[PDB]
Design a protein around this ligand. Structure first.
Ligand SMILES: CC(C)CN(C[C@@H](O)[C@H](Cc1ccccc1)NC(=O)O[C@H]1CCOC1)S(=O)(=O)c1ccc(N)cc1
Lengths: 99, 99
């Protein structure tokens, strides 16, 4: 698909058996999802943006289905106001910015 | 151009005659620039990011060149980890996300 940016680029994802809406965000280095349980080991991380930093849990080797495409990578879980698909997974689905 | 996302999508912008680096950010509704002098009056705006809400200065109808493409629109000035080009100006330069 070709997604225009007149509105927020929101897509459905499936993660841990759950359907969520997420923003495709080229300015996010990594994917961060609202609080949920994920399998496996995690370690703490701080991520920062407008308004400062938030503490998240970093899970590796997580599979997400993004607008029907599967990708695997690191997912950060924490108190984000919006689910964000970041570059670490956008690359895997072949997403590019074009102008 | 086509910009892939293996690295941060950093481009050169020109604003006030000065070259700056900025991040193309589909997850940002608005464009946010580090502190600098811009002409004209400003009005208050609250924007929310991952860490919370913050007050910034809104300048309307500012001329900015982004990776060689001319835009004229709203620029917010405030404490930002990086200059961010948001959807309000990505749409003016015709940017789309493709996968
Ligand atoms: C600020 C950029 C450099 C980094 N952020 C991504 C941005 O796309 C961010 C995404 C977002 C949208 C809505 C609410 C909360 C966050 N939009 C954003 O702040 O919009 C503001 C700036 C002007 O318009 C409004 S991030 O969320 O802090 C972040 C940082 C690290 C990772 N791993 C994940 C995300």
């Amino acid at each position: 698909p070709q997604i225009t940016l007149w509105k927020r680029p929101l897509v459905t994802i499936k993660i841990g058996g759950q359907l969520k809406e997420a923003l495709l965000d080229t300015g996010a280095d990594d994917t961060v999802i609202e609080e949920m349980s994920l399998p496996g080991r995690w370690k703490p991380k701080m991520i920062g943006g407008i308004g400062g930093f938030v503490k998240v849990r970093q899970y590796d080797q997580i599979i997400i289905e993004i607008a029907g495409h599967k990708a695997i990578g690191t997912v950060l879980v924490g108190p984000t106001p919006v689910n964000i698909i970041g570059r670490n997974l956008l690359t895997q689905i072949g997403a590019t910015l074009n102008f």
